Design a protein around this ligand. Structure first.
Ligand code: PEB
Ligand code: PEB
Ligand code: PEB
Ligand code: PEB
Ligand code: PEB
Ligand code: PEB
Ligand code: PEB
Ligand code: PEB
Ligand code: PEB
Ligand code: PEB
Ligand code: PEB
Ligand code: PEB
Ligand code: PEB
Ligand code: PEB
Lengths: 47, 177, 164, 380, 164, 164, 177, 164
């Protein structure tokens, strides 16, 4: 429509994008820890 | 560089053909409206000084991010360089329209321009818009349809030269893209 | 190719200028003179069968020694390639009548000719003999008009002066 | 007409430097004109000589054992007989110039090197390269050098007393010539012995093949890739050192790139150009809310206009202000400052920033996606 | 002076060539266009008093602030020198109509003007106001003929574009 | 940016020398004068919303013709962009007081200004009118100290001399 | 090139901010220990001639393979170029420490130095070691902890300038890597 | 001579600029530091007979082989010319303390020394031995003040680094 940068929200004053891009205000943590991320990266084995 | 006359000569030299009577109908028609071509080039070079400041200021009121701090037209030096390559492109397009062939345009102006503007960080979106506004001014000045300047001409039709210069301007735009 | 067009827009490009009134004024003469210089173009293009024929035997009539063994025109295929060169030069003169300048001559017949004609033992006097024989056989109301004959002879003698 | 004359033309009698040089990259870096003054201290003759050895040899070490060659021809300049152009003519015809730049070189490399040494420029097109090749092959190296110096282009630009320098003209006819000039001088820490490969190929570093790249670019009109113009260049030795909204300097290419991040970035840029090309048309038409009322409100505001000081008492109280070009119409100091945040506030301009930086991130990844077989990958 | 003649002669001299057919062909347009561009020359030369007078007061009518003290036209001798400048510029346009090119303008009015007009506080907009007022008051069958009016206006707007 | 630092180490880099005693001695003056030239910096930085206001209307009070139609300040947004330019120039003077040289002025306001002001019909006299109005309204014990006023006026008149 | 004063000016020019009183705390502290900066630069340029022959000989007495036949420092010409290289890097580091900003270091010395050595075949391992020995000499000369030369100074602390020049040297090392 | 003055006005002359604020600011350090660097000048000038004497015998005490036949100091007049060279170098250091830069050293002792000392078999280590012996015998409150001693040692060291 417009504002190439749409927004989140619902009700009057909305644009068609859910609140938080998925109606998730506070999202869970998906990233792993330091040694976990390193160990799955496959390149930091010696480290 | 080539012109309209030599363009058919390199086409005939590719087959070792003499330029016969078939080939000269395109060139004797180039002579018949040659006065319209000179009258069309004279209208562009008369208002060429207004055309750059017209187009670049239109490109600015398009996008205020160019005069934003850090923007590509933010400094007086950068604004002078943008007004400089507006004029260079308008100069080579008027060369190509005078010659009747686009050859001098794309080995002296557009050859190596895309990677130059990529290496400089010149934004290509506004470069397209500065050329398109100059194209719109060119068709208005050739067909004598500017809002506040009318030039004296002999009566007749001129949409062929207007379409030729419109064909040169999107060659420029596709080159810088 | 050096013509009326490519001269005035490279002088403008070297100075970084738009096409001024002198640049437009130079092309106005390309409107007047092109009625005369193009009239000789189809005249040479339609009757190029006999001019090469006429010039080639005049070259060997001036210089009969070329058919001796060890010379340039000793066998038949060398004479066949000799007539092809006069056809090439008349084609370049036909091109130069169409562009309006000495562009195609200077690019395709003049540049580097003085090396290949000395390396391959081709005598340049026998080359200019045929062009001079074409030059003095111009009946100025019969071959073409007056101005077209002037424009034709001015391109023939340019090739004569450049080859010698 | 913003540029009056070029730098190929001789300098006008009204200007100290050329007009093209005042707002090009000339004013920034060390590629400037070094003029020899008419009487010189033996101090300040060496300022000229160091710039000459920096330019003519094109960044060479030159141990003083290799300087006792040139101690004869420098002495005619130290006396004041040789001009600067005859000094570079005498230096080009010396043997140390020959053994470095002629005596292991292909002809393309030597021609493009003396274009960079004796003039401040790249080879322009192919037709000017061929005429110098045919100038060498029939007359020799000695007349080949005079073909460069003794023509029109040297004396109108350098005269006889400026040292040659890399010319930032601003007006390039063949365009690419700027990229060839930036790729021929490789920045401040390069040389021609290094860029020509005359040391790795050489034996104990001497007797090296002075090979050349970019001879496919001279013949076919195929212009220089952007990485040799943005990474190692005089553009960043003569940089303006400011805040650019797209940073033009390339990041070094990352190890361990994957095709998945390239696919998501290539989808991002295709969404952004489509958003830009539709946000363009709405701008300058529906850009403002108080725009239809701009013509309406002017006639309400035109009443009660007075010249001197003190009016608009508004009942009994005397105080009033007005009387000001910017103030007569209600504007404040913040009214002209809204143009200074447009990079991060204009809805159209945001897309144009993020288009260019997604492009700049994109362009380095396929340079890193040119290596396939013994190439280990990660999981981000 | 840049003209049609000094254009082909300088383009050939630099190449070391004799005057070719393009060089002769460029001067043929100097025969056709000189009937039109010289007809405006005596028209401007004979009535050069009614044009400077009509441009000078139009300059001060657009910009009445110039007669204030501290400005450029504060006293009488400064206005006298101001009318002299419009006379100078119309004389240079008269010369350029005779030369056929923008030679005398570029040598005597254009080169170095942007320094002296900034140093001596002369506003260039007030200079181009008089030239524009001359430009729109060209009655194309009454002042001169049609092509003479085209040639006159093309030299007026060249000075307008060069001063701004 | 041209400053006390960047001058003496580029003179050393061009000669290939280590920083000598002259190079160290030049920076000792950058210790003494920076007490005075930095005192004007926050004085201009804190009260920059009264100086642009007082210069902008003085520019239009000297030249009331700019608000005419067809001129540079005909509508409201053009006057809004005009006050922004005086804010830009005072910001560059504030920068030059901080570096200690004419670096940021010469890079960001001076280089290329004489092309854009002639192309977009901006009169340079109206630009220097506001800077001169800021220059004569310097109460030397009230605005700042004495040497800070000297350092401020020396950067204002440099911009005045460079714009004219 | 830039210095410490102009560095905050390009930071304020990116947002069109005046340099206010917040920004001048960092610069008036640059003036307070400016005499320590001059006293630190003077200690380095005094022993700069020993520093190159110190560092390059340390790099030799570690990787003999450089003076091996065919090695990169095998010829007198190559040894003179390596000693010439060292001095250039020590010169630009002393420029950057004097200016208080690393800008003149990485557009006049390190920009394009990566390819210069790669294309020459200069081994980068020893290039790292020649720079790190010079860094270790720099921290010893600034903090007045050399073994056999002590210089007269006013008493006080100087680890900030030592950490600044240590920050410049690994910029050099990461550039040539 | 390279000094604080001759550096900043040749940087201005190469750019074609008037002396800016930076130029003036560089000479302000030439006012502060000249109290310290001139105090060592008369101290070296008045006691210049006890320093050459104490350096010359220290040179021969480090290198006793120079008095052998065939060496540099074999006879008496060669030792007389050897003490004259240390007097010359201390005179050039006295000059450089007065100009404020390494001008007179670089012109009169440094340029061309590496050729004459190799041609005439003069060992440079014996030259720097005397200068180093003058360098470590600087009692910083007794010979001069503190900053005068710093300025003196910084010029001695420069000659040491330039000779080796
Ligand atoms: C022969 C052909 C030829 C051209 C076409 C031009 C084009 C051109 N412009 C610039 C250089 C430039 N070009 C621009 C132009 C623009 N930036 C924008 O945002 C706008 C879209 C556009 C103006 C309308 C700017 C702003 C610079 C300066 C970049 C800088 O200073 O960092 C350069 C590099 C040299 C220089 O730095 O000046 C070149 C080659 N010049 C030529 O010689
Ligand atoms: C948002 C910012 C913005 C601007 C700065 C102007 C600039 C501008 N003008 C034109 C359009 C044009 N621009 C010109 C140029 C000129 N006209 C003249 O009479 C002079 C000779 C010369 C400048 C002095 C011409 C001739 C046209 C065609 C229509 C006409 O004016 O008659 C266009 C393209 C079509 C259009 O949008 O109208 C733009 C962007 N318009 C804008 O929307
Ligand atoms: C040296 C400089 C020089 C020039 C500037 C041109 C000037 C010029 N233009 C035309 C003549 C003309 N010019 C036009 C052109 C137009 N008419 C319109 O209504 C359109 C707006 C515009 C289309 C682009 C037309 C239609 C004619 C008449 C047809 C023709 O002569 O070909 C003519 C022939 C009529 C005459 O004036 O005698 C001439 C000499 N020729 C020159 O030698
Ligand atoms: C394209 C341009 C063009 C020309 C230059 C001439 C060229 C020309 N004319 C003739 C052929 C001829 N040419 C002439 C003409 C003349 N004989 C004279 O003695 C007079 C000097 C002159 C007339 C004034 C005559 C009379 C013939 C026929 C007999 C003959 O060969 O002389 C021939 C020999 C082959 C042939 O018969 O066609 C050639 C090449 N014709 C052309 O189409
Ligand atoms: C485009 C312009 C163009 C030309 C002008 C010719 C020029 C030319 N002629 C010859 C080659 C030749 N040219 C001739 C011609 C002659 N010998 C003579 O004694 C007479 C002067 C003349 C005939 C009238 C002969 C006999 C040869 C053969 C020589 C050889 O094979 O060594 C060759 C070598 C290749 C070849 O065999 O074709 C070339 C380039 N070719 C061109 O492509
Ligand atoms: C050398 C070339 C040349 C010209 C350009 C004109 C120029 C010209 N004409 C007039 C003077 C005039 N000029 C005109 C002409 C016109 N009035 C109009 O409204 C129409 C637009 C146009 C006719 C189509 C008229 C009608 C007068 C007399 C009244 C007036 O000033 O308008 C004046 C004022 C002084 C005077 O009366 O002479 C001038 C300078 N005459 C020349 O000799
Ligand atoms: C050959 C070409 C040629 C010119 C174009 C003029 C240009 C010119 N004008 C002036 C000088 C002047 N020129 C003007 C003219 C004007 N002031 C204005 O406000 C108006 C724009 C305009 C009148 C319409 C004035 C008022 C002076 C006097 C300024 C002064 O004495 O400082 C001077 C300085 C010497 C002198 O007094 O003559 C010069 C060179 N002179 C020439 O020789
Ligand atoms: C950052 C540096 C700095 C300055 C240069 C001044 C600048 C300055 N002072 C005043 C405002 C003023 N300035 C003065 C000062 C003087 N009036 C005179 O007639 C004397 C010549 C001079 C004192 C010797 C006075 C008395 C006022 C208040 C009334 C007035 O405008 O004159 C104004 C108008 C807006 C305002 O009221 O603030 C400005 C921009 N103030 C600053 O903060
Ligand atoms: C970093 C330094 C810097 C500057 C100095 C200015 C300089 C400047 N001003 C304008 C643009 C302008 N500048 C003015 C200003 C004025 N017109 C007048 O009559 C007065 C002299 C003055 C107000 C006091 C006006 C009215 C315009 C609009 C002109 C136009 O849009 O064509 C433009 C074109 C782009 C734009 O609209 O911003 C530029 C680059 N901008 C900068 O970025
Ligand atoms: C402006 C910045 C600038 C620099 C940083 C230097 C660096 C530099 N060194 C060399 C050139 C060289 N550099 C070295 C240096 C070394 N090899 C080693 O094994 C060691 C690790 C290291 C010394 C410590 C050597 C040995 C050569 C000579 C290579 C050869 O002669 O083949 C070159 C190529 C030019 C030439 O051949 O002399 C350059 C640009 N020069 C500069 O102008
Ligand atoms: C294997 C080969 C080898 C060498 C050639 C030397 C070289 C050398 N010296 C130092 C370490 C140093 N090198 C110097 C340099 C100098 N010291 C001075 O007193 C002079 C002024 C100047 C040379 C004349 C300084 C000042 C230090 C710091 C410690 C100190 O000397 O007080 C280091 C780094 C730390 C260390 O290893 O000690 C190296 C490699 N040491 C080695 O291990
Ligand atoms: C033109 C040449 C020139 C210089 C060389 C310096 C010389 C210099 N250094 C310091 C002064 C000083 N220098 C140091 C530095 C140090 N002290 C230590 O114990 C550490 C080893 C070392 C840290 C790097 C300290 C701590 C002071 C005193 C504090 C200060 O003045 O800032 C002073 C102030 C005290 C004085 O001498 O009056 C001066 C003038 N300034 C100049 O103008
Ligand atoms: C122009 C500057 C200037 C100087 C650098 C000194 C230089 C100096 N002092 C002494 C002579 C002396 N110098 C000293 C000083 C010292 N002895 C020490 O062991 C300490 C290291 C140091 C004090 C801290 C003493 C104590 C003498 C007398 C005895 C001796 O020679 O040691 C001598 C030998 C000749 C003589 O007796 O005069 C010289 C050249 N005097 C000067 O006028
Ligand atoms: C203006 C600066 C200036 C100088 C520095 C000296 C440098 C210098 N010394 C000598 C010449 C000499 N210099 C020395 C000096 C020495 N030999 C040694 O072993 C010691 C290192 C040292 C004494 C301490 C000797 C012994 C000679 C005589 C050598 C000879 O005559 O061949 C000469 C040759 C002409 C002459 O005899 O004077 C010159 C130019 N002269 C100058 O004009």
């Amino acid at each position: 429509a417009r504002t190439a940068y749409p927004y989140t929200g619902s009700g009057y004053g909305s644009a068609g994008v859910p609140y938080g891009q998925d109606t998730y205000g506070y999202k869970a943590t998906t990233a792993k820890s330091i040694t976990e991320t390193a160990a799955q990266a496959g390149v930091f084995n010696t480290f | 560089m080539l012109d309209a006359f030599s363009r058919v000569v390199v086409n005939s030299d590719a087959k070792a053909a003499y330029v016969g009577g078939s080939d000269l109908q395109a060139l004797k028609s180039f002579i018949a409206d040659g006065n319209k071509r000179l009258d069309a080039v004279n209208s562009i070079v008369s208002n060429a000084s207004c055309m750059v400041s017209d187009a670049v200021s239109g490109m600015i009121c398009e996008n205020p991010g160019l005069i934003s701090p850090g923007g590509n037209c933010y400094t007086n030096r950068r604004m002078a360089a943008c007004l400089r390559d507006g004029e260079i492109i308008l100069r080579y397009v008027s060369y190509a329209l005078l010659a009747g062939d686009a050859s001098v345009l794309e080995d002296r102006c557009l050859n190596g321009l895309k990677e130059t503007y990529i290496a400089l960080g010149v934004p290509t979106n506004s470069s397209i818009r500065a050329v398109s506004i100059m194209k719109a001014q060119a068709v208005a000045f050739i067909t004598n349809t500017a809002t506040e300047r009318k030039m004296s001409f002999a009566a007749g039709d001129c949409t062929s030269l207007a379409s030729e210069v419109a064909s040169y301007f999107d060659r420029v735009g596709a080159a810088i893209s | 190719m050096k013509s009326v067009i490519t001269t005035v827009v490279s002088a403008a490009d070297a100075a970084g200028r738009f096409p001024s009134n002198s640049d437009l004024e130079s092309i106005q003469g390309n409107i007047q003179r092109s009625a005369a210089r193009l009239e000789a173009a189809e005249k040479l293009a339609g009757n190029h069968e006999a001019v090469v024929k006429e010039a080639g035997d005049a070259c060997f009539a001036k210089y009969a020694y070329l058919k001796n063994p060890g010379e340039a025109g000793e066998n038949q295929e060398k004479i066949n390639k000799c007539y092809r060169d006069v056809d090439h030069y008349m084609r370049l003169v036909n091109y130069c009548l169409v562009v309006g300048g000495t562009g195609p001559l200077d690019e395709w017949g003049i540049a580097g000719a003085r090396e290949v004609y000395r390396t391959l033992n081709l005598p340049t006097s026998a080359y200019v003999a045929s062009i001079a024989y074409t030059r003095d056989r111009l009946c100025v109301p019969r071959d073409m008009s007056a101005q077209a004959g002037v424009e034709f002879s001015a391109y023939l003698d340019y090739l004569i002066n450049a080859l010698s | 007409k913003v540029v009056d004359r070029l730098d190929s033309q001789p300098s006008a009698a009204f200007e100290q430097t050329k007009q093209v040089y005042t707002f090009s990259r000339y004013i920034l870096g060390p590629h400037r004109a070094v003029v020899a003054p008419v009487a010189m201290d033996p101090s300040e003759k060496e300022v000229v000589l160091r710039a000459v050895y920096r330019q003519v040899f094109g960044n060479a070490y030159i141990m003083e054992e290799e300087r006792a060659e040139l101690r004869v021809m420098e002495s005619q300049f130290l006396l004041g007989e040789l001009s600067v152009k005859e000094l570079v003519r005498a230096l080009a015809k010396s043997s140390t110039y020959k053994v470095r730049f002629f005596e292991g070189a292909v002809q393309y490399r030597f021609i493009e090197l003396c274009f960079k040494h004796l003039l401040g420029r790249a080879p322009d097109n192919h037709e000017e390269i061929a005429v110098h090749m045919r100038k060498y092959q029939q007359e020799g190296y000695d007349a080949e050098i005079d073909s460069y110096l003794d023509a029109g282009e040297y004396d109108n630009v350098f005269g006889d007393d400026t040292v040659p320098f890399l010319r930032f003209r601003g007006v390039y006819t063949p365009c690419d010539s700027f990229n060839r000039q930036c790729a021929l001088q490789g920045g401040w820490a390069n040389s021609d012995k290094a860029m020509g490969g005359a040391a790795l190929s050489g034996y104990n570093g001497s007797d090296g093949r002075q090979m050349s790249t970019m001879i496919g670019n001279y013949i076919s009109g195929k212009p220089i890739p952007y990485e040799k113009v943005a990474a190692d260049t005089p553009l960043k030795s003569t940089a303006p050192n400011w805040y650019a909204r797209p940073n033009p300097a390339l990041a070094p290419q990352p190890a361990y790139v994957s095709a998945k991040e390239i696919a998501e970035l290539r989808s991002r840029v295709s969404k952004l150009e489509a958003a830009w090309s539709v946000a363009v048309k709405q701008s300058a038409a529906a850009k403002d809310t108080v725009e239809t009322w701009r013509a309406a409100a002017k006639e309400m505001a035109a009443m009660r206009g007075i010249s001197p000081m003190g009016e608009a008492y508004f009942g009994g109280i005397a105080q009033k202000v007005d009387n000001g070009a910017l103030a007569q119409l209600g504007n404040k100091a913040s009214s002209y400052k809204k143009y200074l945040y447009a990079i991060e506030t204009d809805e159209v301009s945001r897309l144009e920033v993020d288009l260019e930086e997604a492009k700049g991130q994109l362009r380095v990844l396929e340079a890193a996606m040119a290596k396939s077989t013994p190439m280990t990958r990660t999981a981000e």
